[PDB]
Design a protein around this nucleic acid. Sequence first.
DNA 1: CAGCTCTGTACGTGAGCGATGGACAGCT
DNA 2: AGCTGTCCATCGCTCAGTACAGAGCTG
Length: 197
Amino acid sequence: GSHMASFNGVSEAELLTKTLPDILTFNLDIVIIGINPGLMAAYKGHHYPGPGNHFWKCLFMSGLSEVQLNHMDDHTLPGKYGIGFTNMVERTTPGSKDLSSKEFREGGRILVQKLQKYQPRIAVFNGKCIYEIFSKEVFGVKVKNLEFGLQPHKIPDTETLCYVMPSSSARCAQFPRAQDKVHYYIKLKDLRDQLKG
DNA sequence: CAGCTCTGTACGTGAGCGATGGACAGCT
DNA sequence: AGCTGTCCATCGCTCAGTACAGAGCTG
């Protein structure tokens, strides 16, 4: 059975009109770029609340957070950990498959402007799909075998690096557990520690 | 032919839903 | 002992991007 009970009598139609505000400041070490808000994120008004989403679990397992945090802690992340949040696409949908190419490319244009303003040390793409679109649109680059981790391009007119991880969503069968994704959060922590020294 | 894009489909975990029914206490 | 209702453990089930085959282009 489905988990519509977790929406506590709020309809899907109402959730589809909701947005998730960005959590951005200057001098951030990391900005997590999600695809777009999912239904639970639009419902809560906080990043990655999906009970199954691996984000908060991987941030703890990797040592990026010293305690197990949850979505309610997302506003504390810039000050305490140097981490911020944004999304490629603003619109709420149940899945990444409901977004058109035009929406992603409009998202990309808005995103590169936000990155050129805030200039985090590292732009982290939480999903391979959004970086494939970003790269083609911003760097004019399309490689046959896009890989995860550090990308060879910096955000134009900045020193901000691009780093790609598999989506924290548990919809992804290729990295079925938070354990299968934690390697990338550890390498992100190692890349951050290296930049800060 | 060869290589490219585009679209459709298949794919593992683990959390949490409603349904079910066993255990058990209250009350005759 | 017999009846009945609640609670809660448990089960069956749902569901939150990515890789890749193969059709359709095009050089």
